[PDB]
């Protein structure tokens, strides 16, 4: 078991993302390093829901803690543009895990 339940998916229609600068950029549809192009896909993992149990994450000490499952993001490099100019590889934020957030009381 986990404190939070996550689910994974192959994302094939990402057209926009926030990059490491905190700016919105366009994510291109495909890539080319070798002989032919490769469509640009991402492997994402997100929370199934915010409260897998009534009071939040599973296994939390209800009396002393508030809790909530949250989707966390990581950086991956992606071929990107800015209003179809300045095409290049940028570090962008994508859903990568589900983490339990805590606060006393």
């Amino acid at each position, epitope marked *: 078991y986990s404190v939070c339940d996550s689910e994974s998916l192959w994302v094939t229609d990402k057209s926009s993302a926030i*990059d*490491i*600068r*905190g700016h919105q950029v366009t994510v291109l549809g495909e890539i080319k390093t070798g002989n032919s192009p490769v469509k640009q896909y991402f492997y994402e993992t997100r929370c199934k829901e915010a409260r897998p149990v009534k009071n939040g994450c599973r296994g939390i000490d209800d009396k002393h803690w508030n809790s909530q499952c949250k989707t966390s993001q990581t950086y991956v490099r992606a071929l*990107t543009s800015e209003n179809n100019k*300045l*095409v*290049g*590889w*940028r*570090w962008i934020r994508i859903d990568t895990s589900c983490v339990c957030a805590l606060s006393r009381k």
Partner: antibody, heavy 132, light 109 residues
Framework: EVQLVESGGGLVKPGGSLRLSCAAS????????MNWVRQAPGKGLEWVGR??????????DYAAPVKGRFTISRDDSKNTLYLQMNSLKTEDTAVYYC???????????????????????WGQGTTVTVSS | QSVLTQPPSVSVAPGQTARITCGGS??????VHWYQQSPGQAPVLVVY???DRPSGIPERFSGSNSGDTATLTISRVEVGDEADYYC???????????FGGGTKVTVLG
């Protein structure tokens, strides 16, 4: 206007020592991070080291080829930056520039910070020649 | 200690556009600053944070960042722009400010 005036350059033999000064004016020197940057004759710019403001801890960091031989210090009551160069090497021959850092909104930059930390003022430099 | 790479030289005629690229190191993870060094003078900041211009720098000087590479573009070049241009980044992987090797911009006046 901001002024940075380096002094103390000169010619020494390998293994000698020199002490560079940089007299600053026209800005709150005590709030600025200060750097030394050098340029060997006919080559590019090379960061030598930095000293933080006292607010941000007043600590120093040095470039790899200079660590253990050079010491940066500052005297806020005289608005002066110092570079103590001991055990000099011929590779240390360069013009030495004094530099302020700008774009520090949050004190010491964090791991995730993308923007900030440029060199907004440079002095005109002092020449150090190390030759046998 | 990581290598910020620039072409060593660019020649341009007055009125034309000069372009200086910079890659490697922490480009894409930390912003790029650009310095102009005229012969016999100290460097001068001409672009900061990829694309911002300090006060007093002509609008002809603009920088851009394409993620893995950064470009300084000097439009309507003048003979006064003949200088060495250096890009600069904070290198995460070695805890150093690092500069590119420098690009000598020759203006054919």
């Amino acid at each position: 206007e901001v002024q940075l005036v380096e002094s103390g350059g000169g010619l020494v033999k390998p293994g000698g020592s020199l002490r560079l000064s940089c007299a600053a004016s026209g800005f709150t020197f005590s709030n600025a991070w200060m750097n030394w940057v050098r340029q060997a004759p006919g080559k590019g710019l090379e960061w030598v080291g930095r000293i933080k403001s006292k607010t941000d801890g007043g600590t120093t960091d040095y470039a790899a080829p200079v660590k253990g031989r050079f010491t940066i210090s500052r005297d806020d009551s005289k608005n002066t930056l110092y570079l103590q160069m001991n055990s000099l090497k011929t590779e240390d021959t360069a013009v030495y520039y004094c530099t302020t850092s700008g774009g520090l909104l949050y004190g010491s930059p964090s791991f995730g910070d993308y923007y900030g930390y440029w060199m907004d003022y440079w002095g005109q430099g002092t020449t150090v020649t190390v030759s046998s | 200690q990581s290598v910020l790479t620039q072409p060593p030289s660019v020649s341009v005629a007055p009125g034309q556009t000069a372009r200086i690229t910079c890659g490697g190191s922490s480009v894409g993870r930390k912003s790029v600053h650009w310095y102009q060094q005229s012969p016999g003078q100290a460097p001068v900041l001409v672009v900061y944070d990829d694309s911002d211009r300090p006060s007093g720098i002509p609008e002809r000087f603009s920088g851009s960042n394409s993620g893995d590479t950064a470009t300084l573009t000097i439009s309507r070049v003048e003979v006064g722009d003949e200088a060495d241009y250096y890009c600069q980044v904070w290198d995460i992987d070695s805890d150093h400010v690092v500069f590119g090797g420098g690009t000598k911009v020759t203006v054919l006046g």
